[PDB]
Design a protein around this ligand. Structure first.
Ligand code: HJK
Length: 282
């Protein structure tokens, strides 16, 4: 590369290959994302995301459009939440650290949402951690500009609603919360219908009482099986009553009923939040 002294593939991301790269002029290590194309609107829209700065969002440092190729340059972090959860599977992530991470992620969502930016595809691979106890969300705003792990997808998306709201991100974060606590994915579906039916088997099949308008969703079928709903006490033990209450508000079926990021920060579950230091093996 003409502007990067060295470049190493990290892995296959949601938009193309992601590289660890060293800027040739400055020496700075960045995450360089090559967008897999064959989009003038996307360039201007994403370029606006360069302006956003919060401690819990991965900075978009640059948008590079050269040689008819598109690259996004982001601030590099040394581990994602997926790998951290794997590394913590025998002990679990300590509760104070789960709580710190959830609090920080909600601050990042609240910031992004207040600026009219959604994620739409939050998942452990786009939640990145550092050695100082921070966690940051990567790739906020890209999905709208550009138009597969289904495990974190909100039910309205799975039911074919093409109108996204802030609530889709709260759903995904609720699923991630549950996974940090239990050390297993909450809804590890293998297809859209398996994903939907895993949700239904835990939370009950939605109906017009809990979710007015659900039966007019594009992909809703009156033939869906009708499962009863399970208690969160069975789903995320040993999470306490405060954590279970918050999770239940993040996982309401009706997106309009789900707690906002701002309201979630005020929940009693955060009546003793702290910022612990994680043990990261790099
Ligand atoms: N080390 C590192 N890795 C990634 C990364 C690498 C591969 C995949 C993804 C997410 C996905 O494609 O869904 C993210 C970063 N994104 C911003 N900063 C980053 N730093």
């Amino acid at each position: 590369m003409e502007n990067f002294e060295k470049v190493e593939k990290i892995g296959e991301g949601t938009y193309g290959v992601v590289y660890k790269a060293r800027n040739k002029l400055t020496g700075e290590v960045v995450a360089l994302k090559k967008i897999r194309l064959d989009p003038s609107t996307a360039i201007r829209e994403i370029s606006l995301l360069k302006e956003l700065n919060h401690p819990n969002i991965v900075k978009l440092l640059d948008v590079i459009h050269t040689e008819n190729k598109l690259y996004l340059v982001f601030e590099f972090l040394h581990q994602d939440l997926k790998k951290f959860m794997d590394a913590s599977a025998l002990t679990g992530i300590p509760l104070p650290l789960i709580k710190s991470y959830l609090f920080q992620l909600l601050q990042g969502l609240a910031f992004c949402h207040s600026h009219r930016v959604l994620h739409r595809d939050l998942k452990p691979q786009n939640l990145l951690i550092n050695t100082e106890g921070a966690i940051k969300l990567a790739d906020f705003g890209l999905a709208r500009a550009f138009g597969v792990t289904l495990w974190y997808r909100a039910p309205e998306i799975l039911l074919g609603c093409k109108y996204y709201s802030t609530a889709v991100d709260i759903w995904s974060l609720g699923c991630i919360f549950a996974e940090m606590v239990t050390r297993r994915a909450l809804f590890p579906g293998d297809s859209e219908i398996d994903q939907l039916f895993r949700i239904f088997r835990t939370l009950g099949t939605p109906d017009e009482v809990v979710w007015p308008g659900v039966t007019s969703m594009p992909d809703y079928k009156p033939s869906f099986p009708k499962w009863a709903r399970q208690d969160f006490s069975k789903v995320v033990p040993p999470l306490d009553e405060d954590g279970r209450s918050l999770l239940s508000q993040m996982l309401h079926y009706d997106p309009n009923k789900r707690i906002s990021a701002k309201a979630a920060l005020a929940h009693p579950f955060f009546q003793d939040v702290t910022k612990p230091v994680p043990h990261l093996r790099l």
